[PDB]
């Protein structure tokens, strides 16, 4: 089966928002936007501008594989934890996301050559309120939990879809001052605009295939090409070969 | 103060079965958004469930 | 690992597999290279009968994964002028890709 | 809203060509590596 | 049986992100990116680069 995710989002924020108060001769006090005079007498009115925007994009594609006989069940499940390097070694912290997967099946053969199976699958992370810093969520993407319960049959060696989910969204707001936000000269200094847009697909595929043959080439030649090139080969040692040699050829 | 707010969201699940057999689909993502500030730090998030 | 083997007539072996491998989920190794020292491998579990001809090797299950991440965080007006506009960026790519098979 | 549809056919084109157009354009393709191809090749064509 | 694992990852981080505030004549205060004036009056605006 084929998990696949696509995420894409962009967001912009621009504009000001004002507050504060003035005073006249200890006779009258004018305040803007809930600024209580009971905390301030001479602190004049302030502003606050925000400016930030970004574009986020992330993919993740994962696949489990497993085989059985026909008319017998089987279970596969898996969960790794993926760490990422928060900036700082003495100023020390970590953040991490577990990524769980589960699948159980029950296949059989048909007469004309197609395969019929019985699917319960799961995928995702557990809901964790974490990764407090801005890029800490950005480091490892999130994919929601999902669950299917479906029998589905498919012709031999080809691929059929089993379920999915898409989503599109916007957001638009223009926050401003009523009178002064429409004059042509500096009227756009009193705006506060913040768009938002994200759009995400995620779909579960499936494809079986029939298998009758042993692996070509052999597995003992696979790992001996791994260990002599990843730099961990351990047959040179004249202290440890006296007990590995009981263990490689019988 | 005055403002004008407008927002859309369109989502769709897909799933198949055979006939005369049940099936379940459910899903919930959590959507984060970037509150302004990295040392002055905070987040806010909404889960979006479907069944 | 627990098993239950038997012989066939033509010479092949049929077995009955439940296997497990991994570490328990531990929030630890707080310093940056402390996670880097010992790699992590997730937990896994199979439940499978599978037969195989004599003396040769067959696959029993696995897991692969590929991923990216891209973001360009910047200032709206001043992040596009040609001279020093790229002093206001904040880019952070990320990419990992992992296989594991039994 | 709701709308069903009847389906009898496999997906055209195949799924192995879909993701191999994803991974070579999203920038995560992992078949170039001469350290990891020795165990993915047991796993793509049988 | 043969367990086997391969892991590979790379990551890069570059760029700045700004914050802070200014003041004019104790009459007006302009702040960038959620810097509250209620904690700072003369502390001028700073930056932060990561590499």
Residue numbers in the entry:
A (entry chain N): 308 to 557
B (entry chain O): 359 to 409
C (entry chain M): 410 to 511
D (entry chain O): 512 to 557
E (entry chain M): 308 to 358
Any passages from the paper?
The injectisome is a specialized bacterial organelle that utilizes a type III secretion system (T3SS) to translocate effector proteins from the bacterial cytosol directly into a eukaryotic host. Composed of >20 different proteins, the injectisome forms a syringe shaped nanomachine that spans both bacterial membranes and that of the infected host. The major structural unit of the injectisome is the basal body, composed of three highly oligomerized concentric rings spanning the bacterial inner membrane (IM) (PrgH and PrgK in the Salmonella enterica serovar Typhimurium SPI-1 T3SS)3–6 and outer membrane (OM)7 (InvG, a member of the secretin family of OM pores also found in the type II secretion system, type IV pili system, as well as the phage assembly system). To address this and further elucidate the structural basis for injectisome assembly and function, including that of the central needle component, we have conducted here a cryo-EM analysis of the assembled native needle complex resulting in 3D reconstructions of the IM and OM rings at resolutions permitting atomic model building (3.6 Å and 3.9 Å, respectively) and the 3D reconstruction of an isolated helical needle filament at 3.3 Å resolution.
The density in the core region (InvG176–557) showed defined secondary structure with the majority of side chains clearly visible allowing for unambiguous building and refinement of the structure including significant additionally resolved and structurally changed regions from the previously determined closed form. The most dramatic conformational change upon needle assembly is in the inner β-barrel. In the fully open state defined here, the GATE1 hairpin is now unkinked, with the residues at the tip having moved position by a remarkable ~40 Å (measured from the Gly395 Cα). The open position is stabilized by intimate packing against the outer β-barrel of itself and neighboring monomer i + 1 (monomers defined clockwise looking down from the OM), and extending vertically toward the lip region of monomer i + 2 with a dramatic increase in buried surface area between the inner and outer β-barrels (2111 Å2 per monomer compared to 1153 Å2 in the closed state). The inner β-barrel strands 6 and 7 (termed GATE2 here) are straightened around Gly430 and Gly451 compared to the closed form. More significantly, the GATE2 loop (residues Asp433-Gly451) undergoes a 180° rotation, effectively repositioning the regions oriented above the GATE1 hairpin in the closed state against the outer β-barrel in the open state. These changes in GATE1 and GATE2 of the inner β-barrel result in an increase in the secretin pore diameter from ~15 Å in the closed state to a remarkable ~75 Å in the open state.
